[PDB]
């Protein structure tokens, strides 16, 4: 299995959701970036795995589920089988990553991308090991009801650039944003 990664877009007051939708109007190129980063696999004959909580799964418009070209795994203790359109179900993050070593996944998965929501991000971020965060900073405040966990900069180093990742300020629908990549290894 390849690298372990979180990807997120967050507003200036750390918001990632309001009522199961984006705090901000849709940003088409920002989404294109999320799709390209999560879908692109370095390794022939493998796909990337996306891991998400139940609420994150149901927040994706039906037409985009499952995320195409990616293996889709949902996390839930309540659900007893993968939701309609999803591929895998695990009770927890540690379980999902364990499954990634089983015969049925071991040779199929390249990168793993955690795509939300708050508790799954939080658990990943303080679990020892090599982890990157791909963070889009939406540089305004947006009313939100779910939030990104604190990034501990003592552990997470902001990379000065990354191949495939624009370094400069982006702007869509009047809203400035920028892409960042953080890395820890502990
Ligand atoms: N950088 C970044 N990282 C993520 N994890 C993202 C996740 C999504 C989720 N997809 C989606 C979700 C809702 Cl709530 C409404 C409509 C759509 Cl198309 C969209 N953009 C993302 N950008």
Structural resolution in Å = 1.7
Cis before 95? omega within 30 = no
Method: X-ray
- Out of 5, 52, 74, 115, mutate this one to test ligand 1's pocket (max ligand atoms within 8 Å of CB): namely 115
Could you tell me which residues come within 8 angstroms of residue 98 by beta carbon, excluding any fewer than 6 positions away? Answer: none
d(CA 35, CA 76): 23
d(CA 167, CA 68): 27
- CA of residue 31 to ligand 1 center, whole Å: 6
Cis before 160? omega within 30 = no
Is 30 among the residues known to form the active site?
yes
Number of domains in the chain: 1
Q: Which domain holds residue 79?
A: 1-186
- CA of residue 125 to ligand 1 center, whole Å: 19
Q: What is the DSSP string of the chain?
A: ---EEEEEEE-TT-EEEBTTB-SS---HHHHHHHHHHHH--SSTT-EEEEEEEHHHHHHS-GGG-S-TTSEEEEE-SS-SSPPTT--EEESSHHHHHHHTTSHHHHTTEEEEEE---HHHHHHHHTSSSEEEEEEEEE-S----SEEPPP--TTT-EEPS--TTS--S-EEETTEEEEEEEEEEE-
Give the CATH number for residue 100: 3.40.430.10
């Amino acid at each position: 299995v390849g690298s372990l990664n979180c990807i997120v877009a967050v507003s200036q007051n750390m918001g990632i959701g309001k009522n199961g939708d984006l705090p901000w109007p849709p940003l088409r190129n920002e989404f294109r970036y999320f799709s390209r980063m999560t879908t692109t696999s370095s390794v022939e004959g493998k796909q990337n795995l996306v891991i998400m909580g139940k609420k994150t799964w149901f927040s994706i418009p039906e037409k985009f589920r499952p995320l195409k070209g990616r293996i889709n795994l949902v996390l839930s203790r309540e659900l007893k089988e993968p939701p309609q359109g999803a591929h895998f179900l695990s009770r927890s993050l540690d379980d999902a990553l364990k499954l990634t070593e089983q015969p049925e996944l071991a040779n199929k998965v390249d990168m793993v991308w955690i795509v939300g929501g708050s508790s799954v991000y939080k658990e990943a971020m303080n679990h020892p090991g090599h982890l990157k965060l791909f963070v889009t900073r939406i540089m305004q405040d947006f009313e939100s009801d779910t939030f990104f966990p604190e990034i501990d900069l003592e552990k997470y180093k902001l990379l000065p650039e990354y191949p495939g990742v624009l370094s400069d300020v982006q702007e869509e629908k009047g809203i400035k944003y920028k892409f960042e990549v953080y890395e820890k290894n502990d």
